[PDB]
Design a protein around this motif. Sequence first.
Motif, PDB file in Angstrom:
ATOM      1  N   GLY A 164      -6.384  -7.840   6.973  1.00 55.42           N
ATOM      2  CA  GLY A 164      -7.035  -6.708   6.350  1.00 55.42           C
ATOM      3  C   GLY A 164      -6.086  -5.546   6.126  1.00 55.42           C
ATOM      4  O   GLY A 164      -4.868  -5.647   6.290  1.00 55.42           O
ATOM      5  N   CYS A 165      -6.670  -4.411   5.746  1.00 53.22           N
ATOM      6  CA  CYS A 165      -5.858  -3.228   5.492  1.00 53.22           C
ATOM      7  C   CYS A 165      -5.142  -2.767   6.760  1.00 53.22           C
ATOM      8  O   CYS A 165      -3.988  -2.335   6.698  1.00 53.22           O
ATOM      9  N   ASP A 166      -5.815  -2.827   7.915  1.00 53.35           N
ATOM     10  CA  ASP A 166      -5.175  -2.404   9.164  1.00 53.35           C
ATOM     11  C   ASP A 166      -3.973  -3.282   9.478  1.00 53.35           C
ATOM     12  O   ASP A 166      -2.928  -2.789   9.932  1.00 53.35           O
ATOM     13  N   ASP A 167      -4.121  -4.599   9.280  1.00 56.84           N
ATOM     14  CA  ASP A 167      -2.991  -5.505   9.458  1.00 56.84           C
ATOM     15  C   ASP A 167      -1.850  -5.148   8.515  1.00 56.84           C
ATOM     16  O   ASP A 167      -0.671  -5.203   8.898  1.00 56.84           O
ATOM     17  N   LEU A 168      -2.188  -4.805   7.271  1.00 53.45           N
ATOM     18  CA  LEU A 168      -1.173  -4.440   6.291  1.00 53.45           C
ATOM     19  C   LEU A 168      -0.459  -3.165   6.703  1.00 53.45           C
ATOM     20  O   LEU A 168       0.766  -3.075   6.585  1.00 53.45           O
ATOM     21  N   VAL A 169      -1.203  -2.184   7.218  1.00 56.95           N
ATOM     22  CA  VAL A 169      -0.602  -0.930   7.666  1.00 56.95           C
ATOM     23  C   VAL A 169       0.356  -1.183   8.819  1.00 56.95           C
ATOM     24  O   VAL A 169       1.462  -0.624   8.862  1.00 56.95           O
ATOM     25  N   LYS A 170      -0.048  -2.022   9.779  1.00 55.39           N
ATOM     26  CA  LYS A 170       0.852  -2.370  10.880  1.00 55.39           C
ATOM     27  C   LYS A 170       2.131  -3.024  10.360  1.00 55.39           C
ATOM     28  O   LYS A 170       3.248  -2.635  10.748  1.00 55.39           O
TER      29      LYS A 170
ATOM     30  N   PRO B  39     -12.866   2.072   0.430  1.00 59.12           N
ATOM     31  CA  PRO B  39     -11.615   2.818   0.628  1.00 59.12           C
ATOM     32  C   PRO B  39     -10.499   1.997   1.266  1.00 59.12           C
ATOM     33  O   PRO B  39      -9.333   2.255   0.977  1.00 59.12           O
ATOM     34  N   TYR B  40     -10.834   1.027   2.120  1.00 57.08           N
ATOM     35  CA  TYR B  40      -9.781   0.215   2.723  1.00 57.08           C
ATOM     36  C   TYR B  40      -9.254  -0.833   1.752  1.00 57.08           C
ATOM     37  O   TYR B  40      -8.055  -1.129   1.753  1.00 57.08           O
ATOM     38  N   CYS B  41     -10.112  -1.340   0.868  1.00 55.42           N
ATOM     39  CA  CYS B  41      -9.641  -2.173  -0.234  1.00 55.42           C
ATOM     40  C   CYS B  41      -8.679  -1.377  -1.114  1.00 55.42           C
ATOM     41  O   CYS B  41      -7.567  -1.829  -1.436  1.00 55.42           O
ATOM     42  N   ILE B  42      -9.102  -0.168  -1.490  1.00 57.43           N
ATOM     43  CA  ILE B  42      -8.320   0.693  -2.376  1.00 57.43           C
ATOM     44  C   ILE B  42      -6.991   1.062  -1.725  1.00 57.43           C
ATOM     45  O   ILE B  42      -5.932   1.000  -2.358  1.00 57.43           O
ATOM     46  N   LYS B  43      -7.026   1.436  -0.445  1.00 55.39           N
ATOM     47  CA  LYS B  43      -5.790   1.789   0.249  1.00 55.39           C
ATOM     48  C   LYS B  43      -4.829   0.607   0.306  1.00 55.39           C
ATOM     49  O   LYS B  43      -3.631   0.762   0.040  1.00 55.39           O
ATOM     50  N   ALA B  44      -5.329  -0.583   0.663  1.00 55.50           N
ATOM     51  CA  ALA B  44      -4.444  -1.741   0.766  1.00 55.50           C
ATOM     52  C   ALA B  44      -3.804  -2.063  -0.583  1.00 55.50           C
ATOM     53  O   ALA B  44      -2.588  -2.302  -0.666  1.00 55.50           O
TER      54      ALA B  44
HETATM   55 HG    HG Z   1      -5.868   0.815   7.331  1.00 53.41          HG
END
Ligand code: HG
Length: 106
Positions: free
Chosen positions: A82-88, A25-30
């Motif tokens: 990662g996805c969290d870095d991308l969200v930030k 899901p974090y791959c997909i979200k990113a």
């Molecule tokens: Hg995220």
Amino acid sequence: EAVKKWVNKIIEENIIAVFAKTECPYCIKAISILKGYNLNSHMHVENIEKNPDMANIQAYLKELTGKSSVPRIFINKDVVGGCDDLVKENDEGKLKERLQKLGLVN
Ligand SMILES: [Hg+2]
């Protein structure tokens, strides 16, 4: 040598390079966030779980970025993370800035 050269070619020949795994899901979200900037034409997603050399690839990604986990995201060879870095970066305006500098968003 061969694995490193293969990873390098993915990062260097695509402005947006994402290393991913199967049904994550974090791959997909990113990837969805990136496609939401209409980046599809300059994006490459590589599923490294469907690869005999997954562990080698992950170890090299950790050498490059500090983490072995996917998603692993590079933009113009710069490490996003990662996805969290991308969200930030996305929420704080940094992602748009990157893409503007690349002519990818007006
Ligand atoms: Hg995220």
